[PDB]
A paper describes a structure:
To verify and elucidate structural details of [name] inhibition by [name]-2, we determined the crystal structure of the [name]:[name]-2 complex at 2.0 Å resolution. The asymmetric unit of the [name]:[name]-2 complex crystals contained one [name] dimer composed of monomers A and B. Difference Fourier and Polder electron density maps unambiguously confirmed binding of [name]-2 to [name] in monomer A, at the AI site, but not the BI site in monomer B. [name]-2 bound at the AI site with mostly hydrophobic interactions, as well as one direct hydrogen bond with the side chain of Gln146, and one water-mediated hydrogen with the side chains of Gln61, Tyr126 and Gln146. The ring-fused pyrimidone group of [name]-2 was positioned at site S1 in the vicinity of the aromatic side chains of residues Tyr126 and Phe67. The methyl-benzothiazole group of [name]-2 was directed towards, and pushed on, the first helix of the HTH motif. This resulted in a shift of the helix and folding into a structural conformation similar to that present in the GSH-activated [name] structure. However, the binding of [name]-2 likely prevents the collapse of the N-terminal [name] domain, a process otherwise necessary to line up the folded HTH motifs—one in each monomer—in positions compatible with palindromic DNA binding. As a result, in the [name]-2-bound [name] structure, even though it is folded, the HTH motif has a position not compatible with DNA binding. In the [name] monomer B, where no [name]-2 bound, the HTH motif was not folded. [name]-2 was 2.6-times more potent in inhibiting hly expression of [name] in liquid culture compared to the recently described bicyclic 4-(1-naphthylmethyl)-2-pyridone [name] inhibitor, KSK67 (15); [name]-2 IC50 = 0.026 μM versus KSK67 IC50 = 0.067 μM.
Residue numbers in the entry:
A (entry chain A): 2 to 237
B (entry chain B): 2 to 175, 184 to 237
């Protein structure tokens, strides 16, 4: 993506080097008092929260390119005690202290706009998925996640749109939709298999009825059309 | 809130004049091709979406002072087909076409950062609620919004924290929920005291809405302080 690529060059030409991360490592963690701007360039992460008793709550998944900020831009204080965990095999990220980010975005408002609108995408995304979960429950949520994965990682084949994403575990798909006990994930997947919306062949899901997914995750479909029209359009 | 006041003054000095809306009016709506940045100075609004079914879903509640942007700052296209509806009797809001917001914010970045941080508040807020609901189901969820009412509209009284928000608007907000409420009052958390309900056990709400309590501490520290 162009704006991301420009942002990447802006950061590098200002002395910020890319870091390489590996599966299961934390780019930032919930016990660090320093807050950061993470430019996740390539790879997949998840935001997590570890509770009092050690329970791990998976709250949000992100793919590069994207901007995750662990602290408020103005106060530089924490927006929440969260970790950012790499779930792809490796990931490339630029880690900027928030105070350094303010100075960087201050000097080029084109990049300020890019980061601002990334936040706007996150806001409307959470609203869209709450909208879909409120109407259709876990089915809307699972349909939404599958739709997003289909738009981002889909490859049309004679067997349907192949979700070309490795390590796409059922519980990993469950977590990304908001479902901890994988009882519900396997069940919803069974309804979608029975109604021929998806098949699971080789190691991937193949979407056979995109219209069905869009029908039960309509607000997330609209979110993708408004936020990423060029990606939405490739499969519409 | 100080950044908000300075933002209000910054808008007025640049000609932006506020408008008072009344309950059920739409400050912006899902059918308008033009997008807006709303500085909600005073009052209570809800973000709604009217589905194809004709169903009206309540997605978010906003209280002044706060900023709600119906369109992307760069592209000026919609972030979603949403309405912003007034649920307080009146509300004061500054309505800025998003074209103009870009120039307003470029001139003074202190206010750019203010608007930027309202977005971060929304993002973290949604994740905090999702965390509580995923751990404690509907109990966390109920506890969460009882916690919100307690913090935003809580007065220390002899009988606990009286929810001081006008009960005219309490209805807007409000299945298995009846049972959850009964166990609440059953377990003394909230007391039915002549239709003036009181929160008698903040620690219980805090216990089952922990990530939302943390969000208030981190995002609204003055508000969080009063009842802690
Ligand atoms: C193993 C596993 C499991 C689930 C999963 N989900 C993935 N991808 C996504 O969830 C889409 S990435 C994304 N997330 C968000 C926003 C966003 O803009 N994106 C995004 C980024 C780049 C391109 C398209 C969408 S705003 C708030 C969350 S991977 C992934 C990998
Ligand atoms: Na941290
Ligand atoms: Na609109």
């Amino acid at each position: 993506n162009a704006q991301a690529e420009e942002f990447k060059k802006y950061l590098e030409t200002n002395g910020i080097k890319p870091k390489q991360f590996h599966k299961k490592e934390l780019i930032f963690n919930q016990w660090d008092p320093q807050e950061y701007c993470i430019f996740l360039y390539d790879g997949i992460t998840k935001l997590t929260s570890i509770s009092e008793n050690g329970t791990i709550m998976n709250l949000q998944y992100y793919k590069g390119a994207f901007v995750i900020m662990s602290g408020f831009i103005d106060t530089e204080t924490s927006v929440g005690y969260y970790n950012l965990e790499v779930i792809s095999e490796q990931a490339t990220a630029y880690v900027i202290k928030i105070n350094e980010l303010k100075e960087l975005l201050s000097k080029n408002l084109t990049h300020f706009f890019y980061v601002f609108q990334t936040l706007q995408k996150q806001v409307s995304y959470s609203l869209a998925k709450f909208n879909d979960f409120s109407i259709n429950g876990k089915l809307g949520s699972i349909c939404g996640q599958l739709l997003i994965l289909t738009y981002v990682y889909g490859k049309e084949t004679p067997d349907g749109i192949k979700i070309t994403l490795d390590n796409l575990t059922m519980q990993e798909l469950g977590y990304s939709s908001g479902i901890a006990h994988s009882s519900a994930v396997s069940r919803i997947i069974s309804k979608l298999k029975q109604e021929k919306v998806i098949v699971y062949k080789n190691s991937c899901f193949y979407v056979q009825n995109l219209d069905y997914l869009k029908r039960y995750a309509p607000k997330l479909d609209e979110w993708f059309y408004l936020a990423c029209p060029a990606t939405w359009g490739k499969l519409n």
